[PDB]
Design a protein around this nucleic acid. Sequence first.
RNA 1: GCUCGUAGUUGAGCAUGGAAUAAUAGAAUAGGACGUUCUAUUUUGUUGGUUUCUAUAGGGACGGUCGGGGGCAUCAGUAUUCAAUUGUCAGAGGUGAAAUUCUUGGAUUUAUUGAAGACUAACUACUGCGAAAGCAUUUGCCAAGGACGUUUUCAUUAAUCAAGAACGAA
Lengths: 192, 94, 61, 114, 187
Amino acid sequence: EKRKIKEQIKAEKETALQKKKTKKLNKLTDILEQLTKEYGAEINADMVKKITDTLLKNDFKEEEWDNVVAELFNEEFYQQRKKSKKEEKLQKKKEKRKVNELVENALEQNKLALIEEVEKEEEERKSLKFRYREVSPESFGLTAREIFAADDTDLNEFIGLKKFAPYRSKELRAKDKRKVMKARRLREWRKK
Amino acid sequence: PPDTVLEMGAFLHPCEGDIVCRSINTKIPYFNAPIYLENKTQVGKVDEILGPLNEVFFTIKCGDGVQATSFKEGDKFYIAADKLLPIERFLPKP
Amino acid sequence: EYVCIVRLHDALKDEKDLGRSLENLTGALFQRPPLISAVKRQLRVRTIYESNLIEFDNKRN
Amino acid sequence: SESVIEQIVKYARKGLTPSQIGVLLRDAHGVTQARVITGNKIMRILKSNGLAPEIPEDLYYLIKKAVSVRKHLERNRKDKDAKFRLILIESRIHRLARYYRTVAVLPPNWKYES
Amino acid sequence: MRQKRAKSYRKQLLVYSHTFKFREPYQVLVDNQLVLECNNSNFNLPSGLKRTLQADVKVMITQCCIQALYETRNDGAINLAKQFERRRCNHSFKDPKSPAECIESVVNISGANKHRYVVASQDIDLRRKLRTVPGVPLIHLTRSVMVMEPLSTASAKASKITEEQKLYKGLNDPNKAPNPLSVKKKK
RNA sequence: GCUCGUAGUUGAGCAUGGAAUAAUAGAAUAGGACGUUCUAUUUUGUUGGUUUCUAUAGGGACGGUCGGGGGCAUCAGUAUUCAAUUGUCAGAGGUGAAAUUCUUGGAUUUAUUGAAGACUAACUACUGCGAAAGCAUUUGCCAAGGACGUUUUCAUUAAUCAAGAACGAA
Ligand SMILES: [Zn+2]
């Protein structure tokens, strides 16, 4: 019985998130079509990402719809045969589909934000803590792309997680970082 | 017991110490084919095949210690895969 | 064509069910020849084209 | 892919363990392989951003188990098995705390409070 | 010793006792690598076996393993071997067998463990082809921790077959051609 | 008794069978016609189909499972002992046989009711769960777990463990 109740709760959460994502997608593509009609040309994906971030910052409603319409008229907006006709219409539809895919990717970037919004809605319907600390930031000569590309064993060979321990003394951490930050060793690991 | 058994019949009612089943399998069973459960344990063998083509029934010859009154409606009875033969055989050839 | 008497081993709770059962046995049917018949006993399909229940006595079974 | 880094930062601020962040990013982005995002890489990214966990994840889960067992034993004083598993859990906590102090992941002054 | 690993070892020993009739004291054969590792790491081998088996232990060695121990010329290993009680193998003194092959000749008779031995060896493929033999418990010392190997597939199959025959034995024992006139050749 | 754990140490279906005869096929011995082959006696078998289907340790996380594991309420049932009302009448109990006892003031047996301290018949268990002690009536609540699979910020995390501590016994 508990397994059945858990499955029903999971299904309800999934369909609520689906409804929220479809509502955001259709509202965003409507305001994007209006902004494209006013602008008269194609809109950059950076403006769509900024609009998605603005709609993520403030809770969406009719007042937030008016705010999004004002932001579509803001200073950021001002800063920015027959078979052939059918093919051009199909290309315009494909461009609209690509814009919708970009909006879907933006919503996928805020997918856990949508899950948090759904959790807040569920809490409204109903109505310890893992703590981190700030430390000295060292990238150790590696950007995030090369961290993601490298293997876990290769990264552990480069430097261990216990080397930059949160409470290790600064002398030993500096001594390890000096040896790691050698250009020859970094080049050898990159070749490896 | 065979490793793979397929669901063959559903309990209908007892009849004179035999178990009547509506067939929940598309194919026809072999005569005297053993009838199993999900536990792979034999309850008996197929005694008689009867009924129309759309609605096939079969009666099971119950073994020792297996009583027809002990089973209830909705019980499923299982048969081995090699003990089924296609219904096209009994129909006349074109 | 046949006119046949069936004897039931027990009295039916519902009379009309007998007729319904006869209506279930009309059509193409799976039959095996009995032990007394000289024909080899293999499962065949035999068609009953039309059947009609003339009478039924549930007390006489 | 600086956006990925900013959800790492935000989801570390709001209190998720690196394994939870990993499973969340693998579910959200539709990552094909678990090799691409692991807890280790999230630790490296967090250290690159000046973030580091105060206590380790497994010791945090042991402390969570101990808190649940002590609450149950407070509401049920007659359960001797609860006391036995509480002693076992606290022994595991003491062993991991000694190890993590030894490798300097935990501070030297760190005491488990019962 | 933790309670979970002790419980798992007790369950495996119950499997060995019910199916293969192992009885306390357990008869354990040791190998020469184990003797060397217990010498260097200063591990008390009979105490470790008594802890792992949770019962009385009787320790044995063969000619070939202790012969290789004299070949290593370690006085402490020879002394540690010679505290254990002696069980002879029928092999040539001038040309002794390899310790793995010798310990299999002692243990593996006709594909079964006839003498009910327990093998405590460090060598690995020896342990593989002793997993092929059913009902042979395997123990090894890794990183100063003495570990009993899990139950092999052959032992589980033997136990299942033994329970199956328990269900039907013991007290449950019941105790052409056509007629010549039909096929006729032409005139 | 069990577990944790300090000092120290180590590593890190159509009527059955027998006898004789006939027919058919094979194998032997011996012979003809020109090594081939057929031709006389012995021996070995056999006696057509279809009725239309036709013929490494110690921890952590996640997933799906699982248990007579623990505690607290709750609901029944079973058998004893005691007591109170009937009916009946000379024994009941126990043993190798007796005996101590209860008994016309009614013992034992039967029926009904009340009280008390307990246990959960068969299924059912040397292999299930639990660190041990121990653990099967129903329904709820609480926390904990084993095995399997996928793995881990994963070893100065482990193993032996005097002291000491929790449970049990007492
Ligand atoms: Zn030898």
